[PDB]
């Protein structure tokens, strides 16, 4: 009615989406029409596949749940939409998003199907890599958090336990020049206490090294790449926070020597920290910049126009547990600085002229 069927067929012939019309023959849903987009998407020529069921796109990959879903939809005559792994003529893998509508033709007294196919490989791939990045971020965050927990405990307890040892040493020195009948019992009690204090030391290290066990290696990685991976994790939601992102990367300074999951976590933490300082900020600008630097290093700058620093907050930032947030562990910057310095770099912070914060670090 509304448009002539020739024109409509022309539109179908030239749609960018795969479009096919199938016909049920017993247990087969045989293709009776395909458009060029479908030939492109699959690599098959229409002259070759007509009057067969398209399941050959599955190749040998028949342990997919969508397949059974589709089969039951087709038995019921209900529509259905499913993603499947299909394989082009040349073998190449693509994820095919299938929308099938059973349609009953009264004249033919037959059941046809109209199917729309979109290649969704890029979405599947990016979503899978984002899942792996999310999982590994969780893993490394947990071990590194317990790992800083241990080091702070060791360094804070190091003084009392040594004091105890020294008081044992001095007491034993005083009692040596004594004949009181009870002193051998005193000396043995003091020895047992010494041993217990050593035991406290030895087992603080035991839990530390169990949580800190298992370390990685440093390889050449592109900062553009690790900045994009870190942004994918840390900066989703900037647009909803109306934060303006600017990545100024120097093409001569892009390749660094680093352990990629740890630098990912340094950048993710810096990005999150910057977003938080912009929670209620009138100006929201985030700048990431790479430049050549002095000691054959390369400097990465992350600047925000956020809450910034009070007069004497700035010199505490990288100290373990120093925090201004109600639920902050104050550990992000401490872990980041220890990681960067172990990688051969330097890290420091300063307030920006816009009232925000600028963090810089260097890597080779």
Q: Annotated binding residues for FMN, as ranges?
A: 53-55, 58, 71, 86, 96, 117
Least separation in angstroms between CB 157 and ligand ATP: 22
Q: Which is nearer to a second copy, 71 or 118 (CB)?
A: 118
Interaction between residue 55 and ligand FMN (CB under 6 A): yes
Q: Which is nearer to a second copy, 45 or 220 (CB)?
A: 45
Of 269, 292, 289, 286, whose CA–CA distance to 363 is shortest? Answer: 292
Least separation in angstroms between CB 56 and ligand ATP: 38
Interaction between residue 23 and ligand FMN (CB under 6 A): no
Q: Which is nearer to ligand ATP, 33 or 322 (CB)?
A: 322
Torsions phi, psi for 19 (to 5 deg): -135, 125
Interaction between residue 333 and ligand ATP (CB under 6 A): yes
Instruction: Work out which of 43, 79, 201, 330 binds ligand ATP, going by CB under 6 A.
Output: 330
Partner in contact with 291, chosen from a second copy, ligand FMN, ligand ATP, none, beta carbon below 5 to 8 Å by kind? none
Going 307 to 308 to 314 to 320, the CA torsion angle's sign is positive
Residue 256 and residue 220 in contact, taking contact as beta carbons nearer than 8 Å: yes
Site for ligand FMN in 82-111 (CB under 6 A): 84, 86, 96, 98, 100
Instruction: Work out which of 19, 304, 361, 362 binds ligand ATP, going by CB under 6 A.
Output: 304
How far is it, in rounded angstroms, from Cα 19 to Cα 10?
Answer: 12
Residue 87 and residue 61 in contact, taking contact as beta carbons nearer than 8 Å: yes
Interaction between residue 355 and ligand ATP (CB under 6 A): no
How far is it, in rounded angstroms, from Cα 229 to Cα 108?
Answer: 55
DSSP character string of 255-286: EEEE-HHHHHHHHHHHHHHHHHHTTT-SS-EE
Token pair belonging to 310:
């009070």
Residue 64 and residue 58 in contact, taking contact as beta carbons nearer than 8 Å: yes
Site for a second copy in 198-257 (CB under 8 A): 199-200, 203-204, 207, 210-211, 213-214, 236-237, 239-240, 242
Of 202, 213, 210, 209, whose CA–CA distance to 157 is shortest? Answer: 202
Instruction: Work out which of 277, 287, 297, 298 binds ligand ATP, going by CB under 6 A.
Output: 277
Least separation in angstroms between CB 217 and ligand FMN: 41
Binding flags for a second copy, 268-307, as an x/- string (CB under 8 A)? ----------------------------------------
How far is it, in rounded angstroms, from Cα 178 to Cα 272?
Answer: 64
Count residues contacting ligand FMN (CB under 6 A)?
Answer: 20
How far is it, in rounded angstroms, from Cα 314 to Cα 191?
Answer: 46
Site for a second copy in 7-26 (CB under 8 A): 7-12, 14-17, 21
How far is it, in rounded angstroms, from Cα 36 to Cα 44?
Answer: 10
Q: Gap positions in the chain, given as the residue before each gap (C–N > 2.5 A)?
A: none
Q: Which stretch binds ligand ATP (CB under 6 A): 47-55, 88-96, 240-248, 331-339?
A: 331-339
How far is it, in rounded angstroms, from Cα 31 to Cα 57?
Answer: 13
How far is it, in rounded angstroms, from Cα 330 to Cα 327?
Answer: 9
Partner in contact with 269, chosen from ligand FMN, a second copy, ligand ATP, none, beta carbon below 5 to 8 Å by kind? ligand ATP
Chain residues in the site for ligand FMN (CB under 6 A): 20, 22, 29, 53-55, 57-58, 67, 70-71, 74, 84, 86, 96, 98, 100, 113, 115, 117
Chain residues in the site for ligand ATP (CB under 6 A): 269, 273-274, 277, 304, 306-308, 317, 322-325, 328-334, 357
């Amino acid at each position: 009615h509304m448009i002539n069927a020739k024109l409509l067929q022309l539109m179908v012939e030239h749609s960018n989406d795969g479009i096919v019309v199938a016909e049920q023959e017993g247990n087969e849903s045989i293709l009776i029409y395909v458009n060029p987009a479908f030939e492109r998407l699959t690599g098959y020529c229409a002259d070759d596949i007509l009057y067969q069921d398209c399941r050959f796109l599955q190749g040998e990959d028949h342990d997919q749940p969508g397949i059974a879903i589709i089969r039951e939809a087709i038995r019921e005559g209900r529509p259905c939409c499913q993603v499947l792994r299909n394989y082009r003529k040349d073998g190449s893998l693509f994820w095919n998003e299938l929308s099938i509508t059973p349609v009953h033709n009264e004249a033919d007294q037959l059941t046809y199907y109209i199917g729309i196919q979109r290649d969704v490989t890029e979405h599947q791939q990016t979503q899978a890599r984002l899942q792996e990045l999310q999982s590994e971020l969780v893993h490394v965050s947990r071990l590194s958090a317990m790992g800083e927990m241990a080091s702070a405990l060791a360094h804070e307890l190091n003084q009392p336990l040594a004091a105890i040892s020294n008081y044992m040493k001095g007491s034993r020195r005083l009692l040596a020049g004594s004949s009181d009948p009870n002193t051998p019992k005193v000396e043995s009690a003091l020895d047992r206490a010494a041993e217990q204090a050593l035991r406290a030391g030895q087992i603080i290290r035991r839990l530390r090294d169990f949580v800190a066990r298992g370390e990685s290696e440093k390889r050449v990685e592109s900062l553009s790449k690790l900045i994009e991976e870190a942004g994918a994790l840390g900066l989703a939601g900037a647009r909803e926070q109306n934060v303006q992102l600017r990545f100024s990367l120097d093409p001569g300074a892009d390749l660094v020597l680093a352990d990629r999951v740890q630098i990912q976590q340094v950048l993710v933490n810096l990005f999150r920290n910057a977003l938080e300082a912009m929670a209620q900020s009138q100006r929201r600008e985030l700048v990431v910049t790479n430049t050549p630097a002095a000691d054959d290093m390369i400097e990465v700058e992350v600047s925000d126009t956020g809450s910034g620093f009070q007069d004497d907050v700035i010199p505490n930032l990288f100290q373990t547990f120093f925090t201004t947030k109600d639920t902050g562990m104050g550990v992000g910057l401490s872990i980041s600085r220890s990681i960067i310095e172990a990688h051969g770099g330097r890290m420091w912070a300063e307030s920006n002229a816009s009232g925000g914060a600028t963090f810089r670090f260097t890597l080779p």
